[PDB]
């Protein structure tokens, strides 16, 4: 059967490059509009993370799938740093520092999906992309730390750090 795709795409949803500039519920600042609903492109990708890393074939139906694939690849970067953390406060400090890092973007080397992603043509669209992703890289990390850490010991769970070796298909943002 197929993997889990994004249901949130709507024709009224803006496009950046060939991705889906979708609303995000965050206190962080960026080009992403603020959402009112109780579900977002982030809460989905965290719902569907543990299941989508076992599949080996993903068919890109729309552009919101290109936004989900990015997060699902970045969550595997959070867990590499979080498994080394001994307290949630130490994780939130590590999740900040990682989002500030300038990962590759569509068009340049490092990005594993340069072919099936559309780079920004103009410089203004480039500046919007680098600030949309950084808004995802920050709210993703902030929301994992609520889940990874067992409140009984305030230390990472083996049920999340078992997916450290499970890349999305085999790709990584590095």
């Amino acid at each position: 059967m197929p993997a889990y795709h994004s249901s949130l795409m709507d024709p009224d949803t803006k496009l950046i490059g060939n991705m889906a500039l979708l609303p995000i519920r965050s206190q962080f600042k960026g080009p992403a509009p603020r959402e009112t609903k109780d579900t977002d492109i982030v809460d989905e990708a965290i719902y569907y993370f543990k299941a989508n890393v076992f599949f080996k074939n993903y068919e890109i139906k729309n552009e919101a799938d290109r936004t989900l694939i990015y997060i699902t690849l970045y969550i595997s970067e959070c867990l590499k740093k979080l498994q080394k953390c001994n307290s949630k406060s130490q994780g939130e400090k590590e999740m900040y520092t990682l989002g500030i890092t300038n990962f590759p973007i569509p068009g340049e080397p490092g990005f594993p999906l340069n072919a099936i992603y559309a780079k920004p043509a103009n410089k203004q669209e480039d500046e919007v992309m680098r600030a949309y992703l950084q808004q995802l890289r920050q709210e993703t990390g902030l929301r994992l730390c609520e889940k990874v850490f067992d409140p009984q010991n305030d230390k990472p769970s083996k049920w999340w750090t078992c997916f450290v070796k499970r890349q999305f298909m085999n790709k990584s943002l590095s």
């Binding site: 590499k80 080394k84 590095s174």
Partner: protein, 407 residues
Amino acid sequence: RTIGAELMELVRRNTGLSHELCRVAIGIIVGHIQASVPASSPVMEQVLLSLVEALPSGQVCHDQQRLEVIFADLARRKDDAQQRSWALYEDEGVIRCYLEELLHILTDADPEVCKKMCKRNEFESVLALVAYYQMEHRASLRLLLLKCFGAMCSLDAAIISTLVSSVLPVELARDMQTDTQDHQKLCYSALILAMVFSMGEAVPYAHYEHLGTPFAQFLLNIVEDGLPLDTTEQLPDLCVNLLLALNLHLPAADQNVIMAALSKHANVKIFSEKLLLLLNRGDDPVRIFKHEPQPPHSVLKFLQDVFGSPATAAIFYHTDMMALIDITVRHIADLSPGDKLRMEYLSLMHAIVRTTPYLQHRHRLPDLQAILRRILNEEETSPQCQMDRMIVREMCKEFLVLGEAPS
């Protein structure tokens, strides 16, 4: 234009020499035809410069080809689920042949070749052997993989971060507590564990199920009591160097898993005797590799953490603490200003006064008082020398009798 690199590849193929001796043989031959036949000196000097100072376009090294062929089969034999769990064919002689060949290449060939082919595609080939080790149960092959990991740690430090962050140290720490019969595998496992922990990088929290306090008690029981099968007695001096290396990344001695092992042990004497024979000389047995950034001094890091609590300070016998004060004092003075270690011995000494009754017996207190007054009256202005004086003031301020004049 490229002769000196095309000859080294020819010579390593048809002779089997290492990279170093490949350059020696050519530099000697050339350097001798130059001298005996001066008519050929202009040609020879160009040839020597090509050595001192790349390969043709399509030409690829022999050692690079083999590492494409070895890492590819061993990963194919890892992805063979049938043959691993449900054996039918013989595999011990083929794998033993590819792992021997691998060990001669990492040990002899050019490190920059063996670095890139191990650093390729985010350490895809290293991490496979780390899984094949977890999957394999035969000690004839687990031993060769360890000799191969020990050669990959010598090349770069990014590989050490890859292994320590992997499941390797948890399988070694689990195989050593379980399979104590094999002596070589127990002695190499304790060497590799000290290699990968040498740099001080932190690790996942899940490692501390098998690298925590019960693993330290296992190592202390060996240091103190030894094993029967250890005839040559290498293993205590390897289970010491390992404890020093686990304690490198571990901060906050009150939260330290190792120190809970000492305070739980009935009586440690042989572990303490060996720590002082290393401090008397100031040798870091963990520091095998010349990789930067150089981590701290493993011994002083340990003793600074021992004397970070009074439960762990009482392990030292009376005669040994007085020998520790005689050494620490001797190093504080014999060391020059601007050295990095002088503040460690000072912080170590500050830790002794707090957690021990040093002020009741006052061993070598006058010789100490004269050295601290000197260090304060030193007019050096380096930042490091200001860190030393900053410690001494805190030391005298906390304990006034270390500021009084010697009398």
